[PDB]
Amino acid sequence: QRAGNETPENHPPLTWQRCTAPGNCQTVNAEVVIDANWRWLHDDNMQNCYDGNQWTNACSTATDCAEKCMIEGAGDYLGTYGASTSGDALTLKFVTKHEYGTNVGSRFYLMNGPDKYQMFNLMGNELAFDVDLSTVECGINSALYFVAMEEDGGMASYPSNQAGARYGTGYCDAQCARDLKFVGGKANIEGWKSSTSDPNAGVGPYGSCCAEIDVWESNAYAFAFTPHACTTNEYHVCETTNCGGTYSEDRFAGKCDANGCDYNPYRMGNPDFYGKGKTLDTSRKFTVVSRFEENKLSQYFIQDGRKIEIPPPTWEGMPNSSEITPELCSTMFDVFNDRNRFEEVGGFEQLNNALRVPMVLVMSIWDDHYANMLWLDSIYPPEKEGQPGAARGDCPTDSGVPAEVEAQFPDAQVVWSNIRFGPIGSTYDF
Ligand SMILES: OC[C@H]1O[C@@H](O[C@H]2[C@H](O)[C@@H](O)[C@H](O)O[C@@H]2CO)[C@H](O)[C@@H](O)[C@@H]1O
Numbered sequence: 297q298r299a300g301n302e303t304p305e306n307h308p309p310l311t312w313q314r315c316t317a318p319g320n321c322q323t324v325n326a327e328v329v330i331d332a333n334w335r336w337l338h339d340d341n342m343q344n345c346y347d348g349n350q351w352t353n354a355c356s357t358a359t360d361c362a363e364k365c366m367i368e369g370a371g372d373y374l375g376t377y378g379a380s381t382s383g384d385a386l387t388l389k390f391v392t393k394h395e396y397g398t399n400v401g402s403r404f405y406l407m408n409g410p411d412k413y414q415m416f417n418l419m420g421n422e423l424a425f426d427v428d429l430s431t432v433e434c435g436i437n438s439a440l441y442f443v444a445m446e447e448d449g450g451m452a453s454y455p456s457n458q459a460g461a462r463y464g465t466g467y468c469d470a471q472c473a474r475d476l477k478f479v480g481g482k483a484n485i486e487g488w489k490s491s492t493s494d495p496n497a498g499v500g501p502y503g504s505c506c507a508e509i510d511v512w513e514s515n516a517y518a519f520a521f522t523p524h525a526c527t528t529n530e531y532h533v534c535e536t537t538n539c540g541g542t543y544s545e546d547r548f549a550g551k552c553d554a555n556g557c558d559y560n561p562y563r564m565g566n567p568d569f570y571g572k573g574k575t576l577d578t579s580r581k582f583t584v585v586s587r588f589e590e591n592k593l594s595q596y597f598i599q600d601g602r603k604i605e606i607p608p609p610t611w612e613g614m615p616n617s618s619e620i621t622p623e624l625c626s627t628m629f630d631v632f633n634d635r636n637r638f639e640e641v642g643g644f645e646q647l648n649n650a651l652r653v654p655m656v657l658v659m660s661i662w663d664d665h666y667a668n669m670l671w672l673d674s675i676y677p678p679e680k681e682g683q684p685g686a687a688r689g690d691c692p693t694d695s696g697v698p699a700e701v702e703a704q705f706p707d708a709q710v711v712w713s714n715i716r717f718g719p720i721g722s723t724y725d726f
């Protein structure tokens with residue numbers, strides 16, 4: 297759609313840095329912007345083009361909304377979207393009760409200029425950073441990760457969206473975003489169905505799918521490293537039954553892997569390692585190092601100067617190592633006993649493909665209304681329990697209920713920072 301002229305869109309800064317040698321790294325005075333889903337929608341006279349989680353009378357069809365409406369800028373990322381920056385440091389406060397409402401969550405992208413995004417040289421390169429999720433409790437997710445959203449937020453490819461990257465347009469992942477207000481540069485208005493729980497969210501028949509690289513999915517109790525692969529690893533527009541993931545009728549009904557090949561440590565049987573005071577003690581800041589190599593993935597940590605390894609899986613049949621490999625991805629699925637879309641959409645090769653797609657460094661905090669994040673920090677799925685892969689973390693089963701969790705700790709926050717990138721083994725000396 298068009299750009300909203302009432303507000304000027306502010307893009308907070310955020311130094312990050314290419315890393316030549318493990319000591320000679322140089323800083324980039326980047327910036328950041330938020331996804332369009334958190335932005336106000338309206339016709340040429342204050343009246344919105346959507347509202348609550350219901351599209352409006354000021355709007356009619358997908359192809360009409362793209363032209364009749366426009367998106368505005370946020371501005372008070374502090375006072376409205378709870379974001380903050382300290383140079384390299386950044387902060388996103390879970391629950392954000394601004395003057396006229398209470399906004400839940402945030403999602404940001406790196407920016408090589410206000411028009412442009414920060415794409416990344418994935419394969420054969422590593423990503424670093426540091427996080428203080430020290431008070432990110434069960435039910436919540438502070439996520440850092442890459443995905444192949446086109447450099448200009450889908451503006452080139454789509455003529456009807458003349459807003460683009462500078463306002464946070466064109467997002468996709470392995471879930472396929474049916475929740476997106478707009479997709480392929482049109483509106484998700486025609487047939488739009490608003491859920492029960494989420495008064496902000498609904499779901500449209502048009503989701504956009506692309507390759508999804510989630511080195512980070514975490515919390516004070518558990519995490520996972522997870523690559524998702526697509527037939528088409530790049531931005532593509534799906535259509536209803538031919539959509540998969542979260543918002544669709546069948547999860548694996550698509551072009552993409554929404555379950556994927558995760559390393560979830562506690563899921564792999566090493567339950568006393570990560571957490572408050574634990575081996576990987578999450579009550580205080582620590583560093584993640586993630587490399588991305590052909591047919592293999594790796595990730596260390598560095599706490600109190602000390603380089604922390606990753607627990608190997610207990611599970612008989614399964615290979616002894618953290619490293620993401622086919623040996624993993626293969627001897628993983630009947631063992632745990634889940635539907636394998638990893639290789640159902642083309643093994644480590646399609647991901648060895650996915651890897652070589654230019655990516656963007658996302659940054660997010662949320663709360664899942666659909667699994668209550670049970671898939672990350674507890675016994676999932678609780679359709680039985682007592683088997684491998686069930687468990688996930690030290691968290692309980694009635695936790696993750698967005699509301700109730702949004703009521704006990706609404707001031708929790710993630711602190712993203714020290715982001716590093718470069719050739720393999722070149723952001724730290726380990
Ligand atoms: O609550 C803030 C924001 O929610 C947006 O929907 C989010 C959803 O809550 C989150 O769980 C999911 O990961 O992303 C979707 C949108 O991508 C909603 O679009 C906004 O109106 C609202 O400001």
Ligand SMILES: OC[C@H]1O[C@@H](O[C@H]2[C@H](O)[C@@H](O)[C@H](O)O[C@@H]2CO)[C@H](O)[C@@H](O)[C@@H]1O
Pocket residue numbers: 471520542554555556558560634664666667671672676677
């Ligand atoms: O559906 C919840 C959640 O699933 C995440 O992947 C899950 C998968 O759906 C679940 O069935 C399996 O047991 O665990 C994996 C991850 O460990 C998916 O990535 C999320 O987007 C989704 O909300």
